[PDB]
């Protein structure tokens, strides 16, 4: 595969890491494994210390008071790479074994055995108006030349890679996370009776949260507002230990209650930071840099056997709670990410050009033949690059993602390989089912350059619609319903097809974030909405020009750990004349 | 029941002294604040800039006085600026207090409560203090402002500025009233003050003494020497304010404990020195304050490579 | 009622120049200095200087209240005379210095650029404050205060026992106050006149042939024109055109049914030559944008 790899200022000291993101099985974590690459010559005598630091940061500009440093470490380990004697006694990891054969009289294997018991690496809201490193739990491994732990530490010759802490969803699913209250008040009826209950216990991360309320006002007493509010608790027990709280998804409904009556509704909140930028203290999930992530993932304490950790503990709840003419109820449910198959891309995937250089246009080969179609970028992508199969008029489909993985649901008739920029697909045997141009993408970068179309001879779903031709320089506003995709978990890629020619990306939103990214050569005019009430994809149009004529597909995308372009609508046809 | 005899001619001097000494640092730190604002950005600034310009107006009024004193304790001016700067001069009393205090609790927030400090926004909140901060200031030494009035003549032709309590105070009560406004004064001058201070440089130091515990060596020296700042800071404090405390109470107390006159014209005698002691606070707070806020002093004067990529063989 | 009537017009103009000069002191703080230019710094300093004109005024407020009394305090009364005549020179001063670098900037420096840098106008404001403040120096020393009568009226007049001599007191005085009135308003006036008569005759030469424009921008240079003259004329000249004529009386013998005149008077012109630095923050913000 493709591993990590960070060189001193100097370059003596490469650390290969394979994975900056270590999962964090709650009895016990995975080995933060790795090789630290050092030259013999210039270490004359000295040695190579590999050091694993969970820092805990909470004042902005440590020493700010003019001494006072502002950072803790929650734990800490050292492991001395070199040189290495039995009293390491340490078995090579697949990835350690794997990396020292790829070097050569550099292999230095570290492990680090972290304990079970430590906070997720979540930062804090660096706070829009406040500067600074967030105030929050963060780990690092860094490879220092030294030949005494307390010897000076020199930063022209260490290291040093961010690593993540981040804890995936359980695959056993948890219990309703349900809750009910009732209280009295000056009527001697009935207390309110008050029952919240969610879809489960386990929601991936941006997926819809279904609060489902019922109340019953037998007393005279009346509700005038409803609020449903999933709040971010951040358990910092540093130092003085306290809950705080800060609303993440807030829904305040006017729905009211009359006396004698009984009241249910199932409300529908959905995380998402875009709206949640300014609230400082707010919890963010494992950044290497200042880059956008995800509200928190909850902790997954041991089960049981908390003993208030040290740091920012992480939890999520939905507060359910109704005015009366103030009855509350919580429901403790868990928003953490799904395990995705492959290491996820912390970078903003497609972020802020490329040509993609692909080849042969055209080539004729019978069933069941060997053939490869290739392809070139003019910078690097790095395997995040996909593919995409268009038979004459019909949606292209992703075939290859990642440059490796085969896409579920499609035949390993077809298999990537990345070699530096040329990125190739290689068929086992073409099968009947070839009649199709194989296009190439890459989502590096906002500029989503498609491959220029590779024509092979072989000798749920978006409905979109709402199109209209014949306008010279006119508006429009093509329309893409998405039957099972929420936009707050998925990513919309307007693309267009012009005449025999590869497609050129339009226009791609993103909910949970909020930017959106308009295409270089169609700018002021081409704009993107997607309503969420009704998961509809609005591309709004305006001052067409003659070649802005083509067939427009409306995209589908998993907004965390961007994939490919997978599922895809019929296409629309638009034509610019009289 | 006189006062000393070197006094009417050495507390002008000493009045005058503190004049020259607190505005050159406090018109100083005022221009510097003013023109470093948007670089420093920092809750304590506004701070720092009201205690500035409560030492500024704590000073500038003194001038008059030094000269009433030099004319045998008989006030030249108008009744009115008799007022104006008997209130400017308790106002600013008050307030050099209250800034020192809310610098401790802006402190208090940025060392021994971090997380608290940075979810806060410190900007809002340090301007929102600092309105209270003055407006609390104004309102709570608004009695002055008629209190102090010129008149009794005493067949001598002096017009003496004094604290007038005959227009509010009744002539049995005029005890009574006098005391529950010096009390009021002294109370809400150090009382509260200074027991929030107490507790605030206590958690502050066990705080910064905790977190130096270790690490190295050297962060035992400059532990100690952040525990020597805030020693000399508060023991500062203690020796300019608590002579001017302990004399008002001495003062009131002579009147039930009936202290010998010996030892009342003692504090008679002492008490313009207290004065000026306390003015020592605004004298001092330039240096105290501002010069140990690096940028002050400021304004008035390697790389970590790029995460690569390689790929295996299988 | 005069001398009751007077007063409050002080409070009006106490109260007007406290809200002008305060947002024009305010706005011209807000720009930075990349802003900020020699135009920028002298109409601060005129600003200034209008505001201490005002804000030293209540205490002569008060003073005509009690019919030219002076109850607060001796010495003040000689710091608030020099601050009034300090603050009025400068300001005078400092709109002739804005004129004259308007003149030396608009079509000057194409022609002929021989001229001080922007940066040292600073140097130029503080050389002009200094020139105010020794040519205000007498004022304050001649000012001390007395009853004047059986009575206790006390109040500063300008005393000359300095001269030590009763009859050089007319001649010193005299001398004085003509030296002190010509250098306020004849050299001022007579320098911001000749610019404006300057820039008159280029825009005569220059606006011959008719443009698009050229009637709206000749009206509103006629208005900034008029209303730049007649903001000094009708503020400052009555004044030391009265102080002219009290001075020269005696020596003209004016009958008393003037010289009495020329004391009415001179409450009511000391007003309406206030209202000018409280008038001056608005004119120059409406034309601010004109004059660039
Ligand atoms: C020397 O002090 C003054 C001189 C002039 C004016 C004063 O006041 C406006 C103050 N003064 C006062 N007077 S006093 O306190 O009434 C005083 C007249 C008399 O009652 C008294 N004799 C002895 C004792 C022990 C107590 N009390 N109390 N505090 C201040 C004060 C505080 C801080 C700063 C300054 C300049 N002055
Ligand atoms: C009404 O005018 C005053 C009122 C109060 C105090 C004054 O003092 C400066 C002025 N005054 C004065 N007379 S005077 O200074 O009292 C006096 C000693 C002498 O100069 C004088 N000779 C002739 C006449 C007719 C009057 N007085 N001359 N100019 C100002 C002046 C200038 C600018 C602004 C103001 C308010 N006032």
């Known amino acids: 595969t493709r591993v990590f790899k960070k060189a001193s200022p100097n370059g003596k000291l490469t650390v290969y890491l394979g994975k900056r993101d270590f999962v964090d099985h709650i009895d016990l974590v995975e080995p933060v494994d790795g090789v630290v690459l050092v030259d013999p010559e210039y270490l004359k005598e000295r040695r190579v210390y590999v050091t694993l630091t969970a820092a805990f940061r909470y004042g902005r500009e440590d020493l700010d008071v003019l001494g006072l440093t502002f950072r803790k470490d929650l734990f800490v380990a050292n492991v001395q790479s070199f040189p290495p004697a039995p009293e390491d006694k340490k078995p090579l990891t697949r990835l350690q074994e794997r990396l020292i054969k790829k070097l050569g009289e550099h292999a230095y294997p570290f492990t680090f055995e972290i304990p079970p018991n430590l906070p997720s690496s979540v930062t804090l809201q660096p706070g829009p108006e406040d500067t600074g490193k967030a105030i929050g739990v963060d780990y690092e491994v860094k490879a220092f030349v030294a030949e005494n732990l307390e010897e000076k530490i020199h930063k022209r010759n260490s290291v040093r890679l961010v690593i993540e802490k981040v804890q995936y969803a359980p695959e056993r699913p948890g219990p309703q996370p349900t809750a009910e209250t009732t209280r009295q008040f000056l009527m001697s009826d009935k207390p309110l009776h008050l029952e919240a209950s969610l879809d489960k216990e386990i929601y991936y991360h941006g997926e819809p949260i279904s609060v489902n309320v019922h109340v019953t006002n037998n007393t005279n007493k009346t509700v005038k507002k409803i609020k449903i509010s999933v709040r971010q608790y951040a358990d910092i027990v540093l130092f003085n230990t306290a809950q705080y709280k800060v609303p993440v998804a807030m829904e305040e409904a006017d729905d009211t209650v009359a006396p004698s009556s009984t009241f249910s509704k199932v409300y529908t909140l959905t995380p998402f930071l875009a709206n949640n930028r300014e609230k400082r203290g707010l919890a963010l999930d494992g950044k290497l840099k200042h880059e956008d992530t995800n509200l928190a993932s909850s902790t997954l304490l041991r089960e049981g056997a908390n003993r208030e950790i040290l740091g920012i503990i992480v939890s999520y709840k939905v507060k359910v709670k109704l005015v009366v003419s103030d009855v509350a109820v919580e429901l403790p449910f868990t928003l953490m990410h799904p395990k995705p198959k492959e290491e996820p891309p912390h970078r903003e995937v497609p972020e802020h050009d490329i040509q993609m250089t692909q080849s042969p246009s055209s080539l004729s080969a019978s069933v069941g033949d060997r053939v490869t179609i290739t392809c070139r970028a003019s910078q690097s992508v790095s395997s995040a690059v996909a593919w995409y199969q268009q038979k004459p008029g019909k949606a292209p489909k992703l075939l290859i993602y990642?440059?490796?993985s085969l896409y579920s649901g499609v035949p390993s008739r077809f298999s990537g390989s990345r070699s530096g920029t040329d990125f190739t697909l290689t068929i086992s045997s073409l099968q009947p089912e070839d009649f199709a141009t194989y296009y190439c993408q890459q989502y590096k970068y906002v500029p989503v350059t498609f491959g220029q179309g590779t024509k092979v001879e072989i000798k749920v779903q978006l409905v979109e619609s709402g199109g209209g031709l014949v306008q010279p320089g006119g508006s429009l506003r093509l329309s893409c319903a998405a039957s099972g995709f929420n936009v707050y978990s998925s990513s919309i890629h307007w693309v267009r097809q012009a005449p025999g020619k590869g497609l050129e990306w339009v226009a791609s939103?993103?909910?949970?974030?909020?930017?959106?990214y308009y295409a270089d050569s169609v700018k002021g005019r081409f704009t993107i909405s997607a309503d969420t009430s009704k998961n509809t994809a609005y591309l709004q149009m305006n001052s067409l020009r003659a070649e802005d004529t083509a067939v427009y597909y409306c995209a589908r995308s998993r907004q965390f750990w961007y994939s490919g372009l997978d599922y895809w609508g019929q296409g629309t046809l638009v034509t610019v004349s009289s | 029941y006189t006062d000393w005899k070197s006094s009417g001619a050495l507390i002008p001097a000493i009045y005058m002294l503190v004049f020259l000494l607190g505005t050159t640092g406090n018109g100083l730190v005022l221009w510097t604040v003013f023109r470093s604002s948007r670089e420093k950005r920092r809750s304590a600034d506004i701070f720092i800039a009201s205690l500035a310009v409560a030492d500024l107006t704590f000073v500038v009024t003194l001038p008059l006085w030094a000269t009433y004193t030099y004319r045998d304790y008989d006030w030249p001016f108008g009744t009115f600026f008799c007022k104006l700067s008997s209130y400017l001069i308790f106002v600013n009393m008050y307030a050099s207090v209250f800034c020192l205090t809310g610098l401790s609790f802006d402190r208090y927030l940025a060392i021994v409560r971090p997380v608290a400090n940075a979810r806060l926004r410190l900007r809002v909140s340090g301007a929102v203090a600092t309105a209270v901060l003055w407006v609390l200031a104004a309102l709570l030494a608004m009695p002055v402002m008629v209190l102090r009035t010129t008149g009794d003549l005493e067949n001598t032709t002096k017009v003496q500025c004094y604290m007038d309590y005959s227009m509010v105070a009744t002539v049995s009560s005029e005890w009574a009233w006098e005391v529950g406004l010096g009390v009021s004064s002294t109370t809400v001058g150090f009382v509260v003050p200074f027991t929030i201070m107490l507790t605030c440089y206590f958690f502050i130091a066990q705080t910064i003494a905790g977190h130096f515990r270790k690490e190295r060596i050297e962060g035992l020296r400059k532990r100690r020497r952040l525990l020597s700042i805030i020693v000399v800071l508060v023991v500062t404090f203690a020796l300019c304010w608590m002579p001017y405390h302990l004399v008002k109470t001495l003062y009131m107390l002579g009147s039930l404990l009936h202290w010998p006159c010996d030892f009342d014209l003692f504090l008679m005698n002492i008490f313009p020195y207290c004065t000026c002691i306390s003015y020592v606070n605004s004298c001092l707070n330039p240096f105290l304050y501002a010069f140990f806020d690096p940028r002050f002093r400021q304004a008035c004067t390697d790389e970590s490579c790029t995460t690569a990529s390689s790929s295996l063989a299988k | 009622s005069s001398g009751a009537l007077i007063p409050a017009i002080y409070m009006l103009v106490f109260l007007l120049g406290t809200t002008g000069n305060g947002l024009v002191l305010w706005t011209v703080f807000r720009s930075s200095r990349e802003k900020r230019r020699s135009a920028d710094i002298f109409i601060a300093s005129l600003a200034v200087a209008d505001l201490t004109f005002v804000v030293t005024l209540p205490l002569w407020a008060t003073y005509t209240y009690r019919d030219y009394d002076w109850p607060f305090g001796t010495f003040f009364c000689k710091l608030s005379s020099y601050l009034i005549f300090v603050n009025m020179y400068a300001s005078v001063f400092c709109l002739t210095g804005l004129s004259f670098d308007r003149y030396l900037a608009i079509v000057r420096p194409v022609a002929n650029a021989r001229l001080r840098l922007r940066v040292s106008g600073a140097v130029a404001t503080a050389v002009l404050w200094v020139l105010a403040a020794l040519l205000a120096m007498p004022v304050m020393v001649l000012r001390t205060t007395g009853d004047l009568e059986n009575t206790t009226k006390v109040q500063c007049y300008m005393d000359y026992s300095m001269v030590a001599t009763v009859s050089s007191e007319w001649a010193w005085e005299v001398g004085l106050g003509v030296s002190s009135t010509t250098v306020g308003f004849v050299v001022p006036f007579t320098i911001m006149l000749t610019c404006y008569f300057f820039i008159a005759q280029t825009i005569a030469g220059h606006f011959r042939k008719e443009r698009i424009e050229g009637l709206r921008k000749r009206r509103r240079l006629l208005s900034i024109i008029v209303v730049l003259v007649v903001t000094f004329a009708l503020c400052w000249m009555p004044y030391h055109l009265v102080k002219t004529l009290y001075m020269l009386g005696s020596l003209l013998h004016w009958p008393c049914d003037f010289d009495l005149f020329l004391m009415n008077i001179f409450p009511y012109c000391t007003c309406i030559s206030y209202v000018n630095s409280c008038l001056n923050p608005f004119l120059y913000a409406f034309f601010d944008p004109r004059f660039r």
């Open positions: 990642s440059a490796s």
């Open positions: 939103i993103s909910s949970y974030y909020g930017y959106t």
